[PDB]
Design a protein around this ligand. Structure first.
Ligand SMILES: [Mg+2]
Ligand SMILES: [Mg+2]
Lengths: 67, 69, 82, 48
RNA sequence: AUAAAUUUUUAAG
RNA sequence: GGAGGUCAACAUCAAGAACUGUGGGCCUUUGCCUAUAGAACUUAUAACGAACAUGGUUCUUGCCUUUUACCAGAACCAUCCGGGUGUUGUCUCCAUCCAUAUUUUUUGGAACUUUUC
């Protein structure tokens, strides 16, 4: 989710020297630093949420898309 | 120059059709670039075995037709 | 190197016919050939010089004792010669 | 050798000359040696 | 941690 | 006969990724299928031009008394300064494949005698 713009960020920032590749093999996974169920999580409203809760964010969103 | 590819026939019983309308049988043990054959012994074709192991010269071989598949 | 040898090699796979010094014609799938025409063949019939025929599995023949080899006429076409 | 003739089309040169011409033209030379330098500046990025 | 820059004049009625 | 020319004329240059001729079969010339020969120049971050102008109509705007002249985008079209290749003519300058004999080839295991047909 953090890689949405990564490649072009890199390739420009170095003035065309450099390169990047993003690939998914080992199928690693990781905890999202938030706590999935919390009422008090801070909803940034147009900002990237603070790391203390990113999970309550992601879930409170996906549940809105689904239903 | 190149080795006769008889590694398929290694450790199998073969009818060595040999010079002068004769025959030999026996399990294949080895060979060389001249096509000499070293084989664990068998009969001369009614029938009679001579030797424990046998070595056939290259020139003498008409054919070595496989008894086993 | 010999072009006949090359031809023989090419004929690998195909059903070649094959007479010896003895005059004992064979006909079979050519398994392997070498510079010295040390042919191996599969599913091979074996005619005696007198007349009678005998089926046999995987014959080996040493080119020294080979007389002439018939290859299929498709190989005439291409692309060994030029 | 060096040119067609008086009609003056289709020039052809040798290596040493092009070495010297390449030397003298440095202030007007393009100077950028790789394609990858143009990334969002090529045409298609302008059309887009 | 920002580097984001429109124009511009003559005739006739 | 060769080299050229700030010479000319006539062809050809945007397409089913595409040209032309020819042989054979079917329909009845076209067209389809099959066989064969030759394809200059231009094209894949697409094009004759490693460049870069203007005009017409139609819409959308922008200036904003009205028309020329205009502001900046689009669609459809044209004009203009140039270019390549091919053929012919003309003009100018010159000339009449190992090198060698001891098991896979070429240093042979060939010959003699006899029967049948
Ligand atoms: Mg008036
Ligand atoms: Mg009026």
């Amino acid at each position: 989710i953090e890689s949405a713009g990564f490649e072009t960020d890199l390739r420009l920032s170095t003035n065309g020297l450099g390169m990047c590749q993003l690939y998914f093999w080992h199928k690693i996974w990781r905890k999202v630093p938030g706590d999935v169920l919390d009422k008090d999580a801070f909803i940034p409203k147009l900002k990237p949420a603070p790391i203390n809760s990113l999970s309550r964010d992601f879930v409170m969103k996906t549940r809105r898309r689904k239903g | 120059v190149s080795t006769p590819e008889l590694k398929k026939y290694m450790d199998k019983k073969i009818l060595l059709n040999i010079n002068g309308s004769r025959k030999v049988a026996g399990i294949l043990r080895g060979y060389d670039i001249f096509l000499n054959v070293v084989l664990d012994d068998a009969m001369e074709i009614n029938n009679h075995q001579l030797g424990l192991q046998t070595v056939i010269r290259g020139n003498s071989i008409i054919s070595l037709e496989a008894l086993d598949a | 190197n010999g072009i006949p040898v090359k031809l023989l090699n090419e004929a690998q796979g195909h059903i070649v016919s094959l007479e010896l010094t003895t005059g004992a014609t064979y006909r079979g799938k050519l398994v392997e050939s070498e510079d010295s025409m040390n042919v191996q063949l599969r599913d091979v019939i074996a005619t005696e010089p007198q007349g009678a025929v005998t089926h046999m599995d995987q014959i080996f023949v040493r080119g020294s004792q080979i007389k002439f080899i018939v290859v299929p006429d498709l190989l005439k076409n291409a692309p060994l010669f030029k | 050798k060096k040119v067609n003739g008086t009609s003056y089309k289709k020039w052809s040169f040798d290596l040493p000359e092009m070495s010297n011409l390449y030397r003298l033209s440095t202030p007007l030379r393009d100077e950028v040696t790789d394609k990858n330098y143009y990334y969002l500046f090529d045409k298609k990025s302008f059309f887009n």
